[PDB]
């Protein structure tokens, strides 16, 4: 199967530069060009251009190495306006026009002078419960930059899970909560562990939450 895998979230200080990566697998890299795109809440989806596999004007430099099957995009003197999610994408078949079918997972780029800081994970314990439903959770407090991922019981618990979008605190750090609701009758029969990954600070935490 055709697959595009992009590099991880980035923290870039104003004026610096970052190189973004798109590794391809499942096809002849020389037969397809890679398209680059930018998504922001204000400006929406914007096409940047294309990485020719045999190789936004001043802001973006697009390249490719056929030996690594990797397309590249260097973003130059960065400002708050370059804070976005960036996608790479590919056309579906050899003779298709510019419609995009194969997409990477996206890379988040944060343009900031603030320092990266790993989060603290506190438990939100269940007590005495809306009749037959109990609630428990994890508070992921004071981290930077985005993003953070949370799963429960190594991914085996998905019913009743709500991971809230992070809020930005006046301190300049993010904070979020992930809660799961379970039947009251399950409270004392099974262990409940939230798994927290903040890759920008290489923080991985498994936290048990007990009633």
């Amino acid at each position: 199967q055709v697959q595009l895998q992009q590099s991880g979230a980035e923290l870039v200080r104003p004026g610096a530069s970052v190189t973004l990566s798109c590794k391809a697998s499942g096809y002849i890299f020389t037969d397809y060009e890679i398209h680059w795109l930018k998504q922001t809440p204000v400006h929406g989806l914007e096409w940047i251009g294309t990485s020719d596999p045999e190789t936004f004007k001043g802001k973006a430099i697009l390249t490719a190495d056929k030996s690594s099957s990797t397309a590249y995009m260097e973003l130059r003197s960065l400002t708050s306006e370059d804070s976005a999610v960036y996608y790479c994408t590919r056309r579906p078949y050899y003779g298709s026009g510019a419609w995009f079918a194969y997409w990477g997972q996206g890379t988040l780029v944060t343009v900031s002078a603030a320092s990266t800081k790993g989060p603290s994970v506190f438990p939100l314990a269940p007590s005495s419960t809306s009749g037959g439903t109990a609630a428990l959770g994890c508070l992921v407090k004071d981290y930077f930059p985005e993003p953070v991922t949370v799963s429960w019981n190594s991914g085996a618990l998905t019913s009743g899970v709500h991971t809230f979008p992070a809020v930005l605190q006046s301190s300049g750090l993010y904070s979020l909560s992930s809660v799961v609701t379970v039947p009251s009758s399950s409270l004392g029969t099974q262990t409940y562990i939230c798994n927290v990954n903040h890759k920008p600070s290489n923080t991985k935490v498994d936290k048990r939450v007990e009633p």
Binding site: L45, E46, A101, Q105, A135, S177
Partner: protein, 213 residues
């Protein structure tokens, strides 16, 4: 540069209903238009190309039509999982350009929130801060009011709210409100309460606790 315009930023429908989203180009592009669907935290997903052609694997209920400047995207029978932002794109010229997007939102029966309150954990207190979390679980509509009271003193500017996207199965929302105090100040007061008013609640609901109990 061809401008792609979706007039409606938000479109609302119900499960099992038919819904149509419009896209206009400011240049005759014949049928060189694609439609994409993007769910929360996911990359766009190609649904239709060349204005009316279904991409591989797209369910039959997704159709596209139109030619020239006026394009339409339709879902014949809306399903719960169809919540997303939908973008049009012209693939007629360079640079490729996209519409602003139309967010799909589902109408359903009123659902009153389930309210839980969590005191700060011992582990957080030992660290110096105190966050009190009020949770409103699986409600509709979105409009909800949460008020914090500390020993009967109304709180203002001390709390931050977060809301999830519409649930892809029951179309409900969930909401967290987080009151943050210093440890020293948290220990100076006794009663911590969050009061919730919502269209599904005949009268406001209060969850509270006494520090220590």
């Amino acid at each position: 540069d061809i401008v792609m315009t979706q007039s409606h930023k938000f479109m609302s429908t119900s499960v099992g209903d038919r819904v149509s989203i419009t896209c206009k180009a400011n240049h005759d592009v014949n049928i060189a238009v694609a439609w994409y669907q993007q769910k929360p935290g996911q990359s766009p997903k190609l649904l239709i190309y060349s204005a009316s052609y279904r991409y591989t694997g797209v369910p039959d209920r997704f159709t596209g039509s139109g030619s020239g400047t006026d394009f339409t995207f339709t879902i014949s029978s809306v399903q719960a999982e169809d919540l997303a932002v939908y973008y049009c794109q012209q693939h007629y010229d360079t640079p490729r350009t996209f519409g602003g997007g139309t967010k799909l939102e589902i109408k359903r029966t009123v659902a009153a929130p389930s309210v839980f309150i969590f005191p700060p954990s011992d582990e957080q207190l030992k660290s110096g801060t105190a966050s009190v979390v009020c949770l409103l679980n699986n409600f509709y509509p979105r409009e909800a009011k949460v008020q914090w009271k500390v020993d009967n003193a109304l709180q203002s500017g001390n709390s931050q709210e977060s809301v999830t996207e519409q649930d892809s199965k029951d179309s409900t929302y969930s909401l967290s409100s987080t009151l943050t105090l210093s440890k020293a100040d948290y220990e100076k007061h006794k009663v911590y309460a969050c009061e919730v008013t919502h269209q599904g609640l005949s009268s406001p609901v209060t969850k509270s606790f006494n520090r220590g109990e």
